[PDB]
Design a protein around this nucleic acid. Sequence first.
RNA 1: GUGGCAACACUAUAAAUCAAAGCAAUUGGCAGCGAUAGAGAUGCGCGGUGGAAUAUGCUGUUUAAAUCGAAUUUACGCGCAAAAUCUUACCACUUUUU
Length: 132
Amino acid sequence: XXXXXXXXXXXXXXXXXXXXXXXXXXXXXXXXXXXXXXXXXXXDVLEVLMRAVDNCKPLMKVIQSYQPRPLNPDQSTNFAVKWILQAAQKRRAGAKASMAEALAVELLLAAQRKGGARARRDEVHKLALDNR
RNA sequence: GUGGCAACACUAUAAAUCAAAGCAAUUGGCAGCGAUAGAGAUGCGCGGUGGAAUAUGCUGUUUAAAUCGAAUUUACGCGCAAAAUCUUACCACUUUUU
């Protein structure tokens, strides 16, 4: 049950991301959770985040040469939240609204098995299956 | 000189020079020869540079002097942890003592 706190805390620490208060990113990510509630019931939040991250687990990693490597699932979480967040900055700098909305809409879409995180994610899944 | 169908196969010395040409175990430098260990050593991340302006140092140009050294790594926020005169050694001018 504590893995909820683990994934959320890794989300926080990766949301820190430039030198600053993790209070600033922490209120930012909690604002993303509440904005996820607002957009989700607009047109049921830890639920959709846990589903989104468990949708996003890269189980076997690959190393270039191309060689697959087995992966301890905590780094699967850790890559996972990483790919989510660089896709988030892609979408938000393209929108240049806040980041909280962007991480919210991305956690919804990666819950819905859609978005560039899911694209990158399952291509490296299949490419791990390719080069055995 | 002997053999042959021959390519040439022999047998066979020297003239002339040199002061070493060599040999074996090493001890070190190589590896475009492997096994074991160690370094963000990478491919793993973050933030820079190089884009703009300012600061700052250096070359080069000129000026009377832009005092003098530092020069590829390890020089270039270096001697200077500080130049408005003085620091200051360089120049223009006016004097001074050997």
